[PDB]
């Protein structure tokens, strides 16, 4: 039923307009993919999903470092849960370059993150609720996306 | 559950890996929005919907001569159905420069278009059955689009 649009900027966080519940959808873009980025300490790169309480229902790092996609979750003043890991990060951005998305499905119980085309995990959820918050901050000036990424958000599908 | 991409330049048309069908999504981006473009003939832009026998499941028009979106429909080797008109393009297009962005809902009996964040029209279906081919052709060259337009596909989403 309804569209949005979002200019994240890196280090920012937008209050949705409406929020990401179930059988709703949200992609970032990318009009950038440096994974040629320095050393990241630690998430070259994160996006995440927040509760309004500042609950994180997902966090998505990148480390070049590591050569790995993160998982995990935190309640807003509780300690990181069990992570997860996808190996291999070039890999899963293949397909395109100079940009790239992130699409993160919300199955009530499940997160289905896709990097374009390609599903890298079906994340089932640790922390619950619907997202109300969005962020997307580089834990060390060298941001595998562009120094903004837009954000849609495609909500009221129930 | 699936998200495909296609990079569509002015004049093709691309078979889609998955077919939108009801509950389904796909949005264009431009990534440029000329609305001083010249004298279109008659439609400045189009972005079109097919079945896979060339039938039009949706056709929109982009008329800055006219100032109006036109919405449509016919068989493929019938005749332009009951039209449709939006008036005031740029009114439809403000909130964003530079780049804008169409989304198509399937509904199943309806396809609700919404240009950036504004829905445009509840488009009630006139010919029916599931997209399975997509086109961006500019009837004369003006495009309010950039000479590329992204279109990405939410599908699987039933």
């Known amino acids: 039923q309804g569209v949005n649009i979002y200019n994240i900027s890196a280090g920012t966080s937008v209050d949705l307009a409406a929020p990401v519940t179930t059988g709703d959808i949200v992609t970032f873009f990318s009009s950038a993919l440096n994974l040629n980025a320095g050393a990241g300490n630690p998430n070259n790169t994160t ?40 190996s291999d990060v070039a890999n899963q951005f293949a397909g395109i370059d100079g940009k790239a998305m992130v699409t993160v499905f919300d199955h009530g119980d499940k997160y289905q993150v896709v990097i374009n085309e390609k599903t890298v995990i079906q994340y089932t959820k640790q922390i619950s609720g619907l997202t109300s918050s969005l962020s997307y901050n580089a834990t060390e000036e060298t941001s595998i996306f562009s120094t903004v990424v837009e954000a849609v958000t495609y909500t009221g599908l129930a």
């Not at 480390?63 to 979750?73: A, G």
């Open 47 to 86: 996006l995440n999903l927040f509760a309004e309480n500042g609950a994180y229902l997902l966090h998505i790092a990148f480390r070049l470092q590591e050569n790995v996609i993160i998982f995990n979750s935190r309640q807003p003043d509780g300690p990181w849960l069990v992570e997860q890991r996808v």
